[PDB]
Design a binder for this molecule. Structure first.
Ligand code: JFE
Ligand code: JFE
Lengths: 206, 215
């Protein structure tokens, strides 16, 4: 059984979501001023804004326990991989803190780490506008592994066997499991070399 | 302008990002994102979009005839067809930059075990097709990947999303002291050359600790 809490200033963005419950919380519910200002300019200068630690601290205080795995998406995170998804799949409680602006004051994660396990993670080498899309990716990747729910995949085909003058590879129609297993292995390793040579320990392109 | 068409059996999944589009950018015709239910192009009363894999195996494969009709209607020769897949080339910030000046992206979201390969192969004979992965994990389908790609691309298109190597280091804001933790004094020093050097060193350390692959 798993509980996932997502904290965000944009709850509605999380709407794309019995053994697991997922709850979404509006970070602004923990503000005290009438303007509900969650951000301010960075110490030391620079463009953009930083989310204040105070509002986050109060939210996480209420939502997290010492058992919680606090997940913080960030372009500067450790990589979130399939191995990470397997590791997190057996957790009782994930809390996903979604940043906006130019991110969250580092002290939020540092404070939380005195009380619970904290994981700053990146879902890939591109920049999002906030943590919400990363939260959706993480949730989907994790939940499909939850109990009771290498090489690149080769191409797949289904009916009809000829379409627009393009044939399904004859071996797949042959019913010869060994030859089919072999052809699929060759396709996979061929695809991995071309698209992801790093997975086989070769240099990346360009 | 950039037009993005997304084709999916779960059109509701793409609703958040339709919402996240500022009225100004739409009104200025800078961007238009449309979402299409794939079942609109099914042939049968059961609106079937999947069928068993040739050569056997687990799961199901999406039907080429349905996808072919969908893409025939939606794409032109000028379309960049984006097909999320765990077996794709890596989608990176470089990709996002390249795609940000495209006139027309069409994102084909698969489910089950993916789309019959002939769909992409046929499309590639008359338009640019890009099969891409957004990271080394497996999703249930292409929709979350489409959300990521749309966000990463559109935030690079001037004035669209409302937003305006080494890893970025830690950031701090008010208050100067919080739960026993002080903002690093250097940041309040007014020595901006020293601050830049401190930030550079933080970036170097973080990259070493978290992403040694970048070094
Ligand atoms: C914090 O440093 C940042 C620097 C510039 C922009 C942003 C935007 N932003 C805000 C919160 C946030 C959370 C996650 C992500 C993210 C993660 C991955 N893998 N890509 N993008 C991006 C986020 C942050
Ligand atoms: C096609 O090969 C597959 C093999 C096993 C499962 C699935 C699930 N699935 C279906 C359609 C689909 C589209 C994209 C993705 C995806 C992309 C990234 N980076 N992770 N996951 C996953 C998808 C597909």
């Amino acid at each position: 059984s798993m509980k996932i809490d997502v904290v965000t200033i944009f709850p509605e963005y999380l709407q794309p979501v019995g053994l697991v419950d997922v709850a979404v919380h509006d970070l602004r519910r923990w503000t005290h001023d009438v303007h509900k200002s969650v951000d301010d300019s960075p110490y030391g200068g620079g463009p953009g804004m930083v989310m204040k630690p105070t509002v986050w601290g109060d939210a996480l205080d209420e939502i997290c326990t010492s058992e919680t795995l606090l997940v913080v998406p960030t372009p500067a995170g450790y990589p979130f991989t399939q191995e990470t998804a397997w590791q997190w799949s057996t957790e009782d409680h994930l809390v996903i803190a979604c940043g906006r602006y130019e991110g969250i004051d580092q002290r939020v994660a540092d404070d939380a780490a005195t009380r619970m396990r904290v994981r700053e993670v990146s879902i890939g080498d591109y920049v999002l506008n906030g943590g919400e899309a990363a939260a959706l990716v993480i949730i989907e990747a994790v939940l499909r592994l939850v109990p009771g729910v290498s090489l690149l995949e080769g191409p797949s085909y289904t009916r009809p066997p000829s379409w627009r003058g393009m044939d399904v590879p004859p071996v797949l129609l042959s019913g010869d499991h060994a030859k089919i297993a072999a052809w699929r292995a060759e396709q996979s390793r061929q695809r991995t070399i071309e698209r992801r040579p790093d997975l086989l320990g070769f240099d990346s392109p360009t």
